Amino acid sequence: TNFVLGNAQIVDWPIVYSNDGFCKLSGYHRAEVMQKSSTCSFMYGELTDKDTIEKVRQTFENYEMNSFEILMYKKNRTPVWFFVKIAPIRNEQDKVVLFLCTFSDITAF
């Protein structure tokens, strides 16, 4: 799969890790997404749905699990219709410490 891990306890939920799948899909080197928002807002465009952008943030703000279909752009500006799954990860105290964010290209051929 293609995913990144965001720190749930820090503002903007900065990326602490991204796998090779994400780097190949997004076009960004792993070093280039480190500490970038886990919402992947750095990949949004003017055409990205404003309402969905808000719902995504709300999912993080509320430490909840949810999925969304959203338009984002690869580094070279290629438009991609993404399916994004946001899943919180908890510690012993059952406190959300990380967000596992998985991305899939669901653009029709």
Task: Output the six-digit token pair for 46.
Answer: 């003017």
Task: Output the six-digit token pair for 20.
Answer: 């090779």
The whole-angstrom separation of Cα 28 and Cα 15 is 13
SS (H, E, C) the chain: CEEEEEECCCCCCEEEEECHHHHHHHCCCHHHCCCCECCCHHHCCCCCCHHHHHHHHHHHHCCCCEEEEEEEECCCCCEEEEEEEEEEEECCCCCEEEEEEEEEECCCC
Phi/psi at 82 (5° precision): -105, 150
Candidates 84, 108, 74, 109; CA nearest to 2 is 84
Experimental method: X-ray
The boundaries of the domain holding residue 74 are 1-109
Tally of structural domains, the chain: 1
Please count the CA atoms within 13 angstroms of the CA of 40 that sit on its side-chain side: 36
Q: What CATH number corresponds to the domain at position 72?
A: 3.30.450.20
